[PDB]
């Protein structure tokens, strides 16, 4: 079988806390002696339409921030703002702090989300950064400050902090330096994203995953050039495939004995002819939120 | 595009219980709770024992000092051993300080749970599985994954419901509860075993229809009702599972949230089965989903 798999979330769970300012509560990430959270925690309903964050923050004091790790209050002893993230210095270090880094991910890359409410972890699932810099998440009221991450060996690479939902039901947020992915702004307004596209390299990775699991009805005897494939891909609002993507797909190509451009010809046929009512790995749609690495990590 | 997705429970409380158990060169995963480690009993088998193992005889030949239990690289001393159905229980000299509040539960077909896939006692990934009506799961398990567990978390309490033992020829997976009783008719022997023909999980399809209604997608509701028995007889003709009383009860919260009586929703589903969807969609799809339970729907709709 082959399904969406998230990283084990324990190393991140040990970092989640609750942050309250006024009548607003959301989550924070407690690493060493600093708690990171969305800066919109400081806004009232009046502030949120056009918040002058520097002006709002200078009017706050350390004691206006209530931070709770379970049934224990952490005293804030300083604060600062970096882009759209607030950094609350506390007087206590988190002994559960994992080895970690902050990274900014590229569109098409995947990560695990630990959805949290009131500082308590509630669910974990895999997401991709969409080409239009939204994420198709599952986030409800109170989920802000939930984070996205990848794990490599013992090191947690944090790449996402949650801030908002758009009218279409997708989500937007920042890296851990507080810079948004995409053209979004932390104000209380209805915001549209640019047109999304499908992550072609990931669809191909998943077609290879299907073949590995014995699904091969969509294969064909034909091939395509890279440029001819890309012309069709663009027509169907799929991202271009680069030579780097072809290279990245090498190990899957070698495992299955199917050249990348041969799989591209299969995908072209699927775009032009549809799935004829069949499914691939149980799905009626082409899946684009597995990277080549995700397929390899899982299949071996 | 439906707004719903498979969501696992946070795995940290289970990560803190995973160990490795080795007998000879065979290593699998175990679950360390208080001063007991639970694992599949086939750890005591050699390749040759596996076709027709005599587990009672194999266990009598073992002693405490034949079991290597490790949390990471740190050995945990075994002070007793016993077999309960298809699980081995190793008493150890240290109570796991990370033991959560826990219970052992035996789930019903249709129920979902989170799997923490582990190798050599180290977790690799977490994902949601549904117990199919034929008592198999569609996991992602490789060599070395045995002893990985399935669980749900309710408030503080981890309910362990699955321990992994084997892969069937069709690529689906079989295992036990934490008392070592297999789900389904399967046995822990390296023989060819077949799953029964699978069926659609009706209670979960009904949960999905309720989810659609909650989201304002309700074209399929009709003015009619059915008895439970009439519905079940029709359902079987479409390879859908019959509903049990427990299924009716677990749909209670969604029925109350929407005001649509369970048997009225059954009549709507019956019409969909008999007439098809006629080019229409529900929650964006022409296919009905059967791996979200009523609990999963409430979690994703209401938090
Ligand atoms: C933080 O916990 C929270 C998370 C979202 C709540 C629901 N799901 C989420 O992901 N974030 C916020 O409340 C945002 C704070 C802003 C950035 C200061 N706002 C937000 O996400 O707003 C979402 C709502 C629902 C969809 C939508 O378009 N929208 C914006 C408001 C503004 C206009 C009035 C009502 C709608 C349009
Ligand atoms: C424990 O880690 C391991 C997990 C499985 C390995 C492959 N994927 C898994 O999930 N379980 C076992 O090794 C089982 C031990 C038995 C229960 C004593 N055996 C097992 O899972 O066997 C799977 C293999 C591969 C697919 C298949 O059909 N099969 C069974 C054997 C038995 C007969 C010989 C060859 C086939 C038929």
């Amino acid at each position: 079988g082959f399904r969406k798999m998230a990283f084990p979330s324990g190393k991140v769970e040990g970092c989640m806390v609750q942050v309250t300012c006024g009548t607003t509560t959301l989550n924070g990430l407690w690493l060493d002696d600093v708690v990171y959270c969305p800066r919109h925690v400081i806004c009232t309903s009046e502030d949120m339409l056009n918040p002058n964050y520097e002006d709002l923050l200078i009017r706050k004091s350390n004691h206006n921030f209530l931070v709770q790790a379970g049934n224990v209050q952490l005293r804030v002893i300083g604060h600062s703002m970096q882009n759209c993230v607030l950094k609350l210095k506390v007087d206590t270090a988190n002994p559960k702090t994992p080895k970690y880094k902050f990274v900014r991910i590229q569109p098409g890359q995947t990560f695990s989300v630990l959805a949290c409410y009131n500082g308590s972890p509630s669910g974990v699932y895999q997401c991709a950064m969409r080409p239009n810099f939204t994420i198709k998440g599952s986030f409800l009221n109170g989920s802000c400050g939930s984070v996205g991450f990848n794990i490599d060996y013992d090191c947690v690479s944090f790449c996402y902090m949650h801030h908002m939902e758009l009218p279409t039901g997708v989500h937007a947020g920042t890296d851990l330096e507080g810079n948004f992915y995409g053209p979004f702004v932390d104000r209380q307004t209805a915001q549209a994203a640019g047109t999304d596209t499908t992550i072609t390299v990931n669809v191909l990775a998943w077609l290879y995953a299907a073949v590995i699991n014995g699904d091969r009805w969509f294969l064909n005897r034909f091939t395509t050039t890279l440029n001819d494939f890309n012309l069709v891909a663009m027509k169907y609002n799929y991202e271009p495939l680069t030579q780097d993507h072809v290279d990245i797909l090498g190990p899957l190509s070698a495992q299955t004995g199917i050249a990348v451009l041969d799989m591209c010809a299969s995908l072209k046929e699927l775009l032009q002819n549809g799935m004829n009512g069949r499914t691939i790995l149980g799905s009626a749609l082409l899946e684009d939120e597995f990277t080549p690495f995700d397929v390899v990590r899982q299949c071996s």
Side-chain angles (χ1 to χ4, degrees), chain A residues 1-45 47 49-65 67-70 72 74 76-98 100-151 155-220 222-254 256-275 277 279-292 294-296 298-300:
Chain A
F2 187 90
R3 60 225 325 301
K4 283 287 170 46
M5 192 168 307
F7 286 103
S9 56
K11 288 179 176 57
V12 178
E13 293 170 50
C15 302
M16 302 308 304
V17 299
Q18 181 179 250
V19 180
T20 300
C21 184
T23 64
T24 300
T25 298
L26 44 59
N27 307 284
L29 186 69
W30 181 24
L31 303 172
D32 295 313
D33 62 352
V34 177
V35 175
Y36 301 80
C37 71
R39 69 180 174 171
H40 73 249
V41 70
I42 70 182
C43 300
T44 77
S45 50
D47 293 332
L49 280 187
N50 181 22
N52 192 327
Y53 279 110
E54 295 279 15
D55 218 59
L56 296 173
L57 185 61
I58 199 165
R59 303 175 194 266
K60 292 281 179 292
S61 303
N62 289 328
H63 66 91
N64 298 139
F65 299 99
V67 178
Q68 312 212 274
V72 176
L74 314 186
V76 176
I77 61 177
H79 62 265
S80 64
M81 185 167 57
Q82 180 178 6
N83 304 303
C84 303
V85 155
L86 183 60
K87 297 188 288 191
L88 303 174
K89 179 97 76 238
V90 294
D91 70 354
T92 308
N94 185 2
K96 302 180 181 159
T97 302
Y100 77 91
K101 55 200 185 180
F102 292 168
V103 303
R104 184 168 180 91
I105 57 164
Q106 290 279 116
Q109 292 192 259
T110 55
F111 57 97
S112 296
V113 167
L114 181 64
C116 296
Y117 299 89
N118 300 297
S120 290
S122 72
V124 59
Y125 54 89
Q126 200 75 348
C127 277
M129 181 60 59
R130 303 299 312 163
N132 73 356
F133 292 104
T134 65
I135 74 174
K136 300 175 187 285
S138 297
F139 291 116
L140 305 174
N141 279 340
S143 60
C144 288
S146 296
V147 296
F149 61 97
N150 282 276
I151 310 183
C155 182
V156 180
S157 287
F158 294 104
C159 58
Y160 179 81
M161 180 167 277
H162 185 53
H163 296 240
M164 65 194 299
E165 183 172 296
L166 308 190
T168 55
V170 304
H171 297 102
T174 66
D175 64 22
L176 270 291
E177 293 183 325
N179 287 317
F180 266 89
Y181 295 99
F184 311 109
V185 180
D186 51 345
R187 58 166 62 183
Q188 186 73 353
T189 58
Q191 294 174 46
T195 300
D196 206 17
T197 46
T198 301
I199 308 155
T200 307
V201 65
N202 286 5
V203 176
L204 293 168
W206 172 80
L207 290 175
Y208 278 110
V211 169
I212 291 168
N213 276 265
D215 247 327
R216 31 197 309 140
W217 66 264
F218 51 85
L219 295 181
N220 63 45
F222 297 112
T223 191
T224 180
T225 70
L226 186 58
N227 190 65
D228 288 339
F229 171 76
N230 281 333
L231 286 170
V232 175
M234 271 181 294
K235 185 189 186 188
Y236 284 87
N237 280 326
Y238 272 53
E239 289 289 288
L241 195 72
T242 70
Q243 184 61 44
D244 267 305
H245 291 147
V246 171
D247 291 347
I248 288 158
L249 286 164
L252 291 176
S253 179
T256 63
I258 299 168
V260 179
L261 292 176
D262 286 353
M263 192 69 83
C264 285
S266 289
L267 176 53
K268 189 191 289 173
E269 187 176 7
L270 287 170
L271 291 181
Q272 294 174 331
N273 298 333
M275 298 189 47
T279 62
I280 298 178
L281 291 173
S283 173
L285 307 166
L286 301 180
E287 168 72 50
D288 76 341
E289 301 201 352
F290 295 98
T291 68
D294 295 339
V295 175
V296 166
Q298 189 177 153
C299 290
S300 34

mmCIF file of all heavy atoms in Angstrom, chain A residues 117-138:
data_model
loop_
_atom_site.group_PDB
_atom_site.id
_atom_site.type_symbol
_atom_site.label_atom_id
_atom_site.label_comp_id
_atom_site.label_asym_id
_atom_site.label_seq_id
_atom_site.Cartn_x
_atom_site.Cartn_y
_atom_site.Cartn_z
ATOM 1 N N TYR A 117 -4.802 23.121 19.402
ATOM 2 C CA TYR A 117 -5.821 24.019 19.937
ATOM 3 C C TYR A 117 -5.555 24.194 21.419
ATOM 4 O O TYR A 117 -5.382 23.205 22.127
ATOM 5 C CB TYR A 117 -7.222 23.435 19.683
ATOM 6 C CG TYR A 117 -7.465 23.289 18.198
ATOM 7 C CD1 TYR A 117 -7.109 22.135 17.525
ATOM 8 C CD2 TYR A 117 -7.953 24.354 17.446
ATOM 9 C CE1 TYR A 117 -7.283 22.017 16.163
ATOM 10 C CE2 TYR A 117 -8.109 24.246 16.094
ATOM 11 C CZ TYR A 117 -7.771 23.087 15.450
ATOM 12 O OH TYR A 117 -7.916 23.023 14.092
ATOM 13 N N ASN A 118 -5.484 25.447 21.885
ATOM 14 C CA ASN A 118 -5.266 25.742 23.307
ATOM 15 C C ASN A 118 -3.959 25.143 23.812
ATOM 16 O O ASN A 118 -3.848 24.710 24.968
ATOM 17 C CB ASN A 118 -6.447 25.293 24.169
ATOM 18 C CG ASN A 118 -7.732 25.964 23.770
ATOM 19 O OD1 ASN A 118 -7.858 27.185 23.855
ATOM 20 N ND2 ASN A 118 -8.699 25.172 23.324
ATOM 21 N N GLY A 119 -2.957 25.144 22.943
ATOM 22 C CA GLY A 119 -1.662 24.591 23.272
ATOM 23 C C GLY A 119 -1.618 23.085 23.327
ATOM 24 O O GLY A 119 -0.578 22.526 23.683
ATOM 25 N N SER A 120 -2.706 22.404 22.944
ATOM 26 C CA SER A 120 -2.779 20.950 23.017
ATOM 27 C C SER A 120 -2.787 20.352 21.619
ATOM 28 O O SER A 120 -3.657 20.702 20.804
ATOM 29 C CB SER A 120 -4.033 20.520 23.784
ATOM 30 O OG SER A 120 -3.911 20.831 25.160
ATOM 31 N N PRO A 121 -1.858 19.460 21.297
ATOM 32 C CA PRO A 121 -1.860 18.833 19.973
ATOM 33 C C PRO A 121 -3.103 17.982 19.752
ATOM 34 O O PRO A 121 -3.538 17.239 20.637
ATOM 35 C CB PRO A 121 -0.572 17.999 19.992
ATOM 36 C CG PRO A 121 0.329 18.784 20.965
ATOM 37 C CD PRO A 121 -0.605 19.181 22.038
ATOM 38 N N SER A 122 -3.679 18.120 18.549
ATOM 39 C CA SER A 122 -4.921 17.443 18.211
ATOM 40 C C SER A 122 -4.827 16.501 17.018
ATOM 41 O O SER A 122 -5.519 15.476 17.015
ATOM 42 C CB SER A 122 -6.035 18.457 17.932
ATOM 43 O OG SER A 122 -5.809 19.108 16.702
ATOM 44 N N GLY A 123 -4.001 16.784 16.019
ATOM 45 C CA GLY A 123 -3.896 15.892 14.881
ATOM 46 C C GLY A 123 -2.630 16.167 14.106
ATOM 47 O O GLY A 123 -2.033 17.230 14.238
ATOM 48 N N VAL A 124 -2.233 15.195 13.283
ATOM 49 C CA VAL A 124 -1.032 15.329 12.470
ATOM 50 C C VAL A 124 -1.336 14.816 11.071
ATOM 51 O O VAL A 124 -1.930 13.744 10.896
ATOM 52 C CB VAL A 124 0.203 14.653 13.113
ATOM 53 C CG1 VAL A 124 0.005 13.163 13.347
ATOM 54 C CG2 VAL A 124 1.437 14.916 12.273
ATOM 55 N N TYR A 125 -0.919 15.579 10.067
ATOM 56 C CA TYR A 125 -1.193 15.192 8.690
ATOM 57 C C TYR A 125 -0.166 15.835 7.778
ATOM 58 O O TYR A 125 0.454 16.833 8.135
ATOM 59 C CB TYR A 125 -2.614 15.581 8.253
ATOM 60 C CG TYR A 125 -2.950 17.034 8.462
ATOM 61 C CD1 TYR A 125 -2.683 17.971 7.480
ATOM 62 C CD2 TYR A 125 -3.553 17.465 9.626
ATOM 63 C CE1 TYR A 125 -2.998 19.301 7.656
ATOM 64 C CE2 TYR A 125 -3.864 18.804 9.806
ATOM 65 C CZ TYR A 125 -3.583 19.710 8.810
ATOM 66 O OH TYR A 125 -3.896 21.055 8.959
ATOM 67 N N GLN A 126 -0.020 15.269 6.589
ATOM 68 C CA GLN A 126 0.918 15.754 5.587
ATOM 69 C C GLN A 126 0.241 16.761 4.661
ATOM 70 O O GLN A 126 -0.906 16.568 4.246
ATOM 71 C CB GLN A 126 1.393 14.538 4.789
ATOM 72 C CG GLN A 126 2.652 14.728 4.048
ATOM 73 C CD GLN A 126 3.860 14.708 4.937
ATOM 74 O OE1 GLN A 126 3.779 14.772 6.199
ATOM 75 N NE2 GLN A 126 5.015 14.672 4.300
ATOM 76 N N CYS A 127 0.983 17.812 4.306
ATOM 77 C CA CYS A 127 0.537 18.907 3.444
ATOM 78 C C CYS A 127 1.641 19.179 2.431
ATOM 79 O O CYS A 127 2.804 18.848 2.666
ATOM 80 C CB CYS A 127 0.352 20.240 4.273
ATOM 81 S SG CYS A 127 -1.214 20.371 5.106
ATOM 82 N N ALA A 128 1.293 19.844 1.331
ATOM 83 C CA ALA A 128 2.290 20.406 0.437
ATOM 84 C C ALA A 128 2.149 21.925 0.405
ATOM 85 O O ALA A 128 1.050 22.472 0.531
ATOM 86 C CB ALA A 128 2.159 19.878 -0.995
ATOM 87 N N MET A 129 3.266 22.611 0.216
ATOM 88 C CA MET A 129 3.210 24.015 -0.153
ATOM 89 C C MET A 129 2.766 24.107 -1.610
ATOM 90 O O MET A 129 3.451 23.592 -2.505
ATOM 91 C CB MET A 129 4.579 24.646 0.045
ATOM 92 C CG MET A 129 4.622 26.122 -0.295
ATOM 93 S SD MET A 129 3.487 27.151 0.681
ATOM 94 C CE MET A 129 4.065 26.823 2.344
ATOM 95 N N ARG A 130 1.603 24.706 -1.847
ATOM 96 C CA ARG A 130 1.071 24.759 -3.198
ATOM 97 C C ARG A 130 1.890 25.741 -4.036
ATOM 98 O O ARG A 130 2.547 26.642 -3.502
ATOM 99 C CB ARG A 130 -0.381 25.235 -3.200
ATOM 100 C CG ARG A 130 -1.385 24.417 -2.352
ATOM 101 C CD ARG A 130 -1.506 22.985 -2.784
ATOM 102 N NE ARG A 130 -1.693 22.840 -4.223
ATOM 103 C CZ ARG A 130 -1.491 21.701 -4.866
ATOM 104 N NH1 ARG A 130 -1.207 20.590 -4.207
ATOM 105 N NH2 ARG A 130 -1.551 21.682 -6.196
ATOM 106 N N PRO A 131 1.849 25.598 -5.355
ATOM 107 C CA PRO A 131 2.529 26.581 -6.215
ATOM 108 C C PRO A 131 2.055 28.005 -5.988
ATOM 109 O O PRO A 131 2.849 28.940 -6.156
ATOM 110 C CB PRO A 131 2.227 26.066 -7.634
ATOM 111 C CG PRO A 131 2.099 24.568 -7.428
ATOM 112 C CD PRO A 131 1.387 24.419 -6.112
ATOM 113 N N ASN A 132 0.794 28.205 -5.605
ATOM 114 C CA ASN A 132 0.301 29.538 -5.260
ATOM 115 C C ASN A 132 0.517 29.906 -3.791
ATOM 116 O O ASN A 132 -0.019 30.917 -3.327
ATOM 117 C CB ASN A 132 -1.170 29.699 -5.650
ATOM 118 C CG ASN A 132 -2.122 28.925 -4.755
ATOM 119 O OD1 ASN A 132 -1.715 28.191 -3.855
ATOM 120 N ND2 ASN A 132 -3.407 29.115 -4.985
ATOM 121 N N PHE A 133 1.311 29.119 -3.059
ATOM 122 C CA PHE A 133 1.764 29.415 -1.707
ATOM 123 C C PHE A 133 0.661 29.337 -0.667
ATOM 124 O O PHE A 133 0.817 29.853 0.438
ATOM 125 C CB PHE A 133 2.516 30.745 -1.635
ATOM 126 C CG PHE A 133 3.834 30.712 -2.352
ATOM 127 C CD1 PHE A 133 3.985 31.313 -3.578
ATOM 128 C CD2 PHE A 133 4.913 30.025 -1.808
ATOM 129 C CE1 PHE A 133 5.200 31.269 -4.243
ATOM 130 C CE2 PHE A 133 6.131 29.986 -2.463
ATOM 131 C CZ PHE A 133 6.271 30.612 -3.683
ATOM 132 N N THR A 134 -0.440 28.700 -0.984
ATOM 133 C CA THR A 134 -1.399 28.292 0.021
ATOM 134 C C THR A 134 -1.088 26.864 0.447
ATOM 135 O O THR A 134 -0.297 26.153 -0.183
ATOM 136 C CB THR A 134 -2.835 28.390 -0.515
ATOM 137 O OG1 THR A 134 -3.021 27.457 -1.588
ATOM 138 C CG2 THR A 134 -3.159 29.804 -1.004
ATOM 139 N N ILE A 135 -1.740 26.434 1.511
ATOM 140 C CA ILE A 135 -1.722 25.024 1.874
ATOM 141 C C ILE A 135 -3.166 24.562 2.030
ATOM 142 O O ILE A 135 -4.032 25.320 2.483
ATOM 143 C CB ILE A 135 -0.845 24.674 3.093
ATOM 144 C CG1 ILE A 135 -1.478 25.105 4.395
ATOM 145 C CG2 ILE A 135 0.543 25.324 2.968
ATOM 146 C CD1 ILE A 135 -0.681 24.629 5.600
ATOM 147 N N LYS A 136 -3.438 23.342 1.612
ATOM 148 C CA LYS A 136 -4.778 22.784 1.760
ATOM 149 C C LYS A 136 -4.762 22.050 3.090
ATOM 150 O O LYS A 136 -4.514 20.850 3.166
ATOM 151 C CB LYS A 136 -5.106 21.858 0.605
ATOM 152 C CG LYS A 136 -5.078 22.514 -0.773
ATOM 153 C CD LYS A 136 -5.303 21.437 -1.859
ATOM 154 C CE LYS A 136 -5.132 21.950 -3.274
ATOM 155 N NZ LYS A 136 -6.280 22.777 -3.704
ATOM 156 N N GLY A 137 -5.020 22.793 4.158
ATOM 157 C CA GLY A 137 -4.943 22.260 5.492
ATOM 158 C C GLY A 137 -6.310 21.955 6.069
ATOM 159 O O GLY A 137 -7.349 22.060 5.423
ATOM 160 N N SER A 138 -6.274 21.548 7.326
ATOM 161 C CA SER A 138 -7.449 21.315 8.154
ATOM 162 C C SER A 138 -7.122 22.107 9.410
ATOM 163 O O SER A 138 -6.307 21.672 10.236
ATOM 164 C CB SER A 138 -7.640 19.852 8.478
ATOM 165 O OG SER A 138 -7.861 19.103 7.299
#
